[PDB]
Structures are given as structure tokens and as C-alpha cells.
Design a protein around this ligand. Structure first.
Ligand code: NAP
Ligand code: NAP
Lengths: 398, 398
């Protein structure tokens, strides 16, 4: 099978690498990005790791014509969007125009606004069912695997899921004074926004990082976990019936939160451009220029991550709570694919969803066709693939 | 008398304003800067304040020819350099070429290095004694008035000054999350440098803000005061004989020191340029673009400043300690000249040194001619002018 991937990110290095480790399903992996230096480093690395060999071909994913051009040049079974969420619509359109299969790991987001919303991508459901294709939205860890965990609970453990708390802890040490999980422009747009959660029909808003619980993360410890809006809550509230409260929490250190409140104070997190010696510059972009980009840090990053879902509900007129979670070692990820645990936990699920599609395990024939979030699909084989590809989960009743 | 001033800074607004308030000595004040918007706001303000009327004429002080051109266009008695320390040599040269009188408020500093040193300006002593002119170096508050305080002590209170501690506290509240005394590019270059002090012949270095005493500032309170190198120590160690220890301390809040350590961590205090989307940008300059420039903040700044000199010594084989200091109110400064207390405490002394020169009170005939620091001149009339222009001092023995 043949598949084209857009993005040579920290995440991008993982998805490609993971495809090369499953050469039995991925014979033709073509890798496409704005800057080719990244793509050759991935290419050259995989060959050093023993993982076969990939096509590098530059393209500016913002221009739909050049994608259409690249898609039909290799006519692939699926295209993986692991570039920035801006390119979601431009790549998703070039998939429709070439009747090809699309998966991303992130919502749509416009550079001139810090809004998260599926409805721009969801609009393609008529157009996609029609062109008899599939677009699987948000197939990272969160969103994606967390949806799968909730999906998986809904089938196997719960009659009705009353509450959902997604909990994301990154207890890694990148050994630098201040650095980010992934691309700083998108990460820091996300976390500094007014957090948001669903309870009893209406959505509630909070000032950024207003709410905070302490949570005990298996294999780590007790950590301050702050409340955030996250993409998956949009799809999951719509798709999981019964839901009374749905929240997302993330751990941040004091040191991280301080740097972030300082940079915010001087204007370094600004999305609107500002003139400096003639030139018009966006601060938060310049922050990304200045900061080490994260791939660099996997070499010396140590720690583990824990991400998962804490659900309360009812099964056979009796109460039960479930915790599904995945722990992941930064050093172990480095030594497998040269990346750290955030690149890792995101790329592997996307490579899995690719495998689902190529295997027709997830199919537009033998289901409705069109645009779907992960919790809508058959998750059973997806979860089994996650185990096989390095994201084993725990499952815990109380 | 006629005098030309280069700089429409926060400081610049004070020096011009203060000259207009002494119209009996300043009949022709011409004001020269890179951007004319500042100069008209000063012009238009003085007229609103009742202070007469000034000439605005743009010039790029980096190009010595255009200065020579501006100097001879109005042939003035003195030129006041209140632009950035980079223009020190270019303006100081155009003074020699036109045989005119020069005063600045800051050392020489090259944009590609964070070094403070008088020797680049001191080199002009032969050339200046020859052209029978005068260059008074560092005639702000610190440096400048503090030199005068030490000078004044040396004559009137001490036989030999064993120790000198200069103490600078700014207890103002500019009502913003983070902002700077003066131009952020120069301020933040200064404070984040390895501090330095003189004791027993050799100079000692310390990591930035390594050393810290608590000091009780009259009319304020007890404040954490951190040790810094400051320009005046260079000239004063050379010029005041007897000196066993000479230090400079400045107060910084935790909040300020945190912002500064964060910005330092991400690279926002960098003097070397760095490529971003083609363009090559200096971070710390961009920081200055981003931050409110300080003049803006005088409108709502409240608090007081205390700056002065704590000296121990011997007079008539008996020990004595002297504290000379000046307290200054941010709101009171706003309402007088529209500026805050740092702009104020710096501009007034420069306007005074101008008055000394125009009055021939400080003269190249009836003294050596050439290049001098403030402690080298007759300070008695200078101090009296400071009192008259709003910088009264206290003098305290123990
Ligand atoms: N759901 C999850 O679990 C999760 C967690 C983290 C991140 N994510 C998502 O994953 C992506 C981040 O991956 P990353 O963090 O690795 O980003 P990255 O490190 O910045 O690398 C991104 C890649 O995309 C390329 N790119 C961006 N826009 C492009 C365009 N218009 N045309 C061509 N190439 C383009 C960049 O080119 P340069 O080489 O010139 O930069 C780079 O190679 C984002 O979409 C983020 O929202 C999801
Ligand atoms: N010793 C003390 O007591 C003390 C305390 C504070 C500051 N200082 C010194 O005083 C000066 C700071 O005044 P500030 O803080 O008011 O600076 P500012 O607010 O940045 O304004 C500086 C002025 O200088 C102009 N300028 C700079 N380089 C120029 C050039 N090459 N040609 C023409 N105009 C030029 C700027 O033009 P734009 O309008 O385009 O910026 C601006 O009008 C610095 O020299 C600083 O070291 C001394």
C-alpha cells in the first residue's frame, strides 16, 4: 500500500518512523513538508534505524492546487495531516478533489483567531459521504485515543457514562529552563485561552487555568492539574449520550506557568502582528523562532507521561467508575524512534488510524461514509493496534 | 544663548522642558531627533505649559556629517546628547569638528557588545583641550549628580573618603504588569550584566544581581538592594584618592526580577540578531518595540525615588559617615513637566550642566580644557542649581 504524509514535525518524525516499522502495511511512504531539511533528517534517520526508505517531496500545504498535484502524482490510499491546524481545510479540500482518504490530529484553527471548532471540518460530511471517502478527525492521543478510551468504555464497561474527566500529565524533564510539548505557537495559543467545560446541558467558561485539582497519576505521583478546554469535548458531548459533566485537565509546573504569564504580560503571546523597524511581526511566532523547537530536546528528555480518561457511570443499575490511561517513557521513546513522549503518543495513533484505513478495517463501504470523529468508529481493532504499536493501556474499576 | 539638544526621549522631554522654564538662560533651544513625532509632542506640550517655543529639526545622529551640518546651521554654545549611548562617539566627533561644547548622560556602548567604558570618550581629551572646548561626561543623576555628591563630600566634609556606596531606589508604581525605568534596550542590557565593584586596588566581579543588602531609604522604607556595576565607579575610583571600597546598589522587585529572568531564558534579552521568516531581528530591540515605552506611563505613575551616596571616611583624624541623597515624587514630576521621576532626575542635571557651560561657570579658560567627568569640575554652583531646579538633597552625618 501507498500513503502520503504532510508534516515533518516532531510528530511527523514519529508517524513516518512508525510506518517504516510496519513495512508489512506501508510499502510506499511519501513525506511532504514546507522545509525539506526536516524530511531528509527523517529519511536519513529511518535508513540509519533500518526502517526502509521514504519519498521526500516538498509542497506548501496552504495551496490546494499543489496538493491535488502531489496527491495524483502518487495516488495514495490515505493522506496524513500532521502539519499545523491551519492547513486542515486546504488539505481536507485537496483530498475531496482527488477522492482520497484524510486523517488529522487537530481541530481547525485560523491564524487570526484562537478558536477551536470542528464545524469547519464537519461541514465536509455531505461532500465526503458523496465522494465515497472518509475523514477521521483528531487521531492523536488527545484528541483521538482518549476518544477511543471513552468509546471503548461505552461499549464494554458502561450502560451510560455520567461523567468524563480527561487527565493529561507530562512529568518529563527536557533539561532546559523553558520549552514546550510540541510547536510553541499552537501549544501556547491553546493553554492561555479561557478554559471551558460541559455540565448539565450548558457549557461553562473559566479564566485561563482558573480551576485546579490535585490528581494522582500512576507511575508519577500527585500533580496539580489545571482545567482546560480541549477539542475532544466538542465531539464527545455530541456523541456520548448520558453525559452530565465533561472536563479536561492538564498538569503545568509553577515554572512553566510563570514563564507563560510573563511572556503574556509583555505581549509575546500575541496573535496580531505589530510593526518593528518597518517589518510586521507576530510575537508568538517569533517566540517559536526563539524557543528550541521540541524535537531537539528528545535527546536528553527524561520522565514519563500519563494520559487517560476517568469516567463515572452506571451498568446494570449499579454504579461504576473506570480509569483508562497510558503511561509512556520519554527516554524509551527517544531510543525507539528518536522522538520524545509527546511526539510519540501523538504519532503512533495517527499511524494506527492510517493502518485501519489501508486495511479497510475502517471502511466507507460497510458503514456510513464521510467525516467522523474517532469515537464514532469501531475502536476495538484500533485499541489492539495501539497495544501492538507501543501504547498499551491500563483499565481500572472502582 | 543658543543650544541644540539631540534626543526627544522621556529624558529629552525633561531637558527641553527644563530649559524652557529657565528662559532667562535659554533663548534658543533647538531639539533634534530621529523621529519628529516625539519632538512635536514636546514642542506642542511646552507651548501648552507656557514655556516658550523650540526648534524641531530631524537628524540621524549616527551620521557625523549631518550633525556638523546641523551644528553650524544654528552654531550653538553646547550640544546635549540625550539620545542612546551608541551616538556618543558620532555626536562627540561632530562637536570637535565644529569646536562646540558637548555633554552626555551615559557611557559609550557598542550595539554588538554589552560593555561600559569611558575610555572611548576619554580618548578625546587631547583633541578637546586642543580645540579649546569642553566635554562633560555623564551628567545625569547616576552618573552625574552622584559624582557631584561625592565631589561635594570630598571638599566640604571629608579629608579622605574610604568607602563609597551609591544607592538607587525606585519605589514607583507604573500600574502595569512589567515596564522599565527608561529605554528598555539599554536598561535591561545594564542590569543583566555581571555586576562589578572596586575594593583594595582590584575590581571584583559577581554573577548578575548576586549580592544584595537591605537598605532603609528615607521617605520609602527598607528595600532589597542588589549590587551592580555602574558607569560612575570607573571615573570615581580614578578621581577620588583614598578609596578602599566603591559599590553601586539598585533596588529591584521580585516581580521585576522574575520577568527579567524569564525573558532572559527564552532569549528576549539577546543582543545578537537572529533570522525569522527571512528578516534578521535583535530580540531585545523587539522587546523595546513590544513594551510600553516609559514616557507613556508618567500619567499614572505614583511613588517616590531615592538616589544618593553613602560614604565613610576620616576628617581631622576622626571617623565620619555621610549620606547625601535626593528624594523625588513621580506624581509631582508628572504635573510639573509631564514626565516621571526617572526622566526627571536625569534631565534636570543635564539642563543644569548646560547652564553651567553657557554661564561660563564651567569654563575651558580658567581651568584645564578638554574631557572631564563631573567630579572633576566645580560642583558647588552645580549643586546650588540642582536645588533651584527641583533636586534638593539631604546631607546626613553619623
Ligand atoms: N492531538 C494530539 O495528541 C496532539 C498533540 C500535539 C500536537 N498535535 C498536532 O500535531 C501537529 C504538531 O505537530 P508538530 O508539533 O511536530 O509541529 P512542528 O514540530 O512545528 O512541525 C510541523 C511540520 O509541519 C510543516 N508545515 C506546517 N505548515 C505547512 C504548510 N502550510 N505546508 C507545508 N508544510 C507545513 C512544518 O514545516 P517547517 O519544517 O518549515 O516548520 C513542519 O515540518 C499540530 O497539528 C498540532 O496541533 C496533536
Ligand atoms: N545617568 C542617568 O541618570 C540616566 C538614567 C536613564 C537614562 N540615561 C541615558 O539617557 C538616555 C535615555 O534617554 P531615554 O531613556 O529617554 O531614551 P528614549 O526614551 O529611547 O528616547 C531616546 C531618543 O533618542 C533618539 N535617538 C536615538 N538614537 C538616535 C539617532 N542615532 N539619531 C537621532 N535620534 C536618535 C530616539 O529616537 P525615536 O524617537 O525614533 O526613538 C528618541 O527620540 C540614554 O542615553 C540612557 O543611557 C541616563
Amino acid at each position: 500500500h501507498t500513503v502520503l504524509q504532510i508534516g515533518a514535525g516532531g510528530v511527523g518524525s514519529v508517524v513516518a518512523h512508525k510506518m517504516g516499522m510496519n513495512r508489512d502495511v506501508f510499502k510506499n511512504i511519501i513525506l511532504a513538508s514546507r522545509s525539506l531539511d526536516k524530511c531528509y533528517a527523517i529519511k536519513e534517520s529511518m535508513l540509519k534505524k533500518g526502517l526502509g526508505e521514504i519519498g521526500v517531496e516538498q509542497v506548501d500545504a496552504d495551496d490546494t492546487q499543489a496538493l491535488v498535484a502531489l496527491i495524483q502524482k502518487y495516488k495514495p490510499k490515505v493522506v496524513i495531516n500532521v502539519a499545523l491546524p491551519y492547513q486542515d481545510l486546504t488539505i481536507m479540500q485537496a483530498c475531496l478533489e482527488t477522492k482520497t482518504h484524510y486523517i488529522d490530529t487537530a481541530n481547525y484553527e485560523h491564524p487570526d483567531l484562537a478558536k477551536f471548532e470542528y464545524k469547519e471540518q464537519w461541514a465536509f460530511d455531505r461532500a465526503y459521504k458523496e465522494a465515497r471517502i472518509l475523514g477521521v478527525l483528531g487521531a492523536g492521543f488527545d484528541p483521538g485515543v482518549t476518544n477511543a478510551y471513552v468509546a471503548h468504555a461505552q461499549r464494554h464497561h458502561f450502560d451510560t457514562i455520567h461523567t468524563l474527566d480527561i487527565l493529561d500529565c507530562n512529568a518529563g524533564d527536557h533539561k532546559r529552563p523553558f520549552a514546550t510539548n510540541f510547536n510553541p505557537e499552537i501549544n501556547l495559543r491553546e493553554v492561555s485561552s479561557k478554559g471551558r467545560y460541559y455540565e448539565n446541558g450548558k457549557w461553562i467558561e473559566t479564566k485561563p487555568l482558573e480551576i485546579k485539582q490535585v490528581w494522582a497519576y500512576p507511575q508519577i505521583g500527585e500533580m496539580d492539574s489545571y482545567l482546560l478546554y480541549h477539542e475532544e469535548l466538542e465531539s464527545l458531548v455530541k456523541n456520548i449520550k448520558g453525559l452530565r459533566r465533561a472536563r479536561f485537565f492538564m498538569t503545568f509546573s509553577q515554572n512553566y506557568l510563570t514563564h507563560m504569564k510573563c511572556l503574556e504580560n509583555v505581549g509575546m503571546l500575541g496573535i496580531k502582528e505589530i510593526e518593528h523597524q518597518g517589518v510586521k511581526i507576530v510575537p508568538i511566532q517569533f517566540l517559536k523562532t526563539l524557543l528550541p523547537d521540541p524535537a531537539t530536546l528528545a535527546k536528553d528528555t527524561t520522565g514519563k507521561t500519563n494520559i487517560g480518561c476517568y469516567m463515572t457511570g452506571i451498568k446494570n443499575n449499579q454504579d461504576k467508575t473506570l480509569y483508562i490511561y497510558n503511561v509512556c517513557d520519554h527516554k524509551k521513546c527517544y531510543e525507539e524512534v528518536g522522538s520524545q513522549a509527546i511526539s510519540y503518543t501523538t504519532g503512533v495513533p495517527a499511524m494506527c488510524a492510517a493502518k485501519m484505513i489501508c486495511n479497510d478495517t475502517w471502511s466507507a463501504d460497510h458503514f456510513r461514509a464521510g467525516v467522523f470523529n474517532i469515537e464514532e468508529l469501531n475502536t476495538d481493532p484500533f485499541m489492539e493496534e495501539l497495544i501492538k504499536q507501543g501504547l498499551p493501556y491500563e483499565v481500572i474499576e472502582r
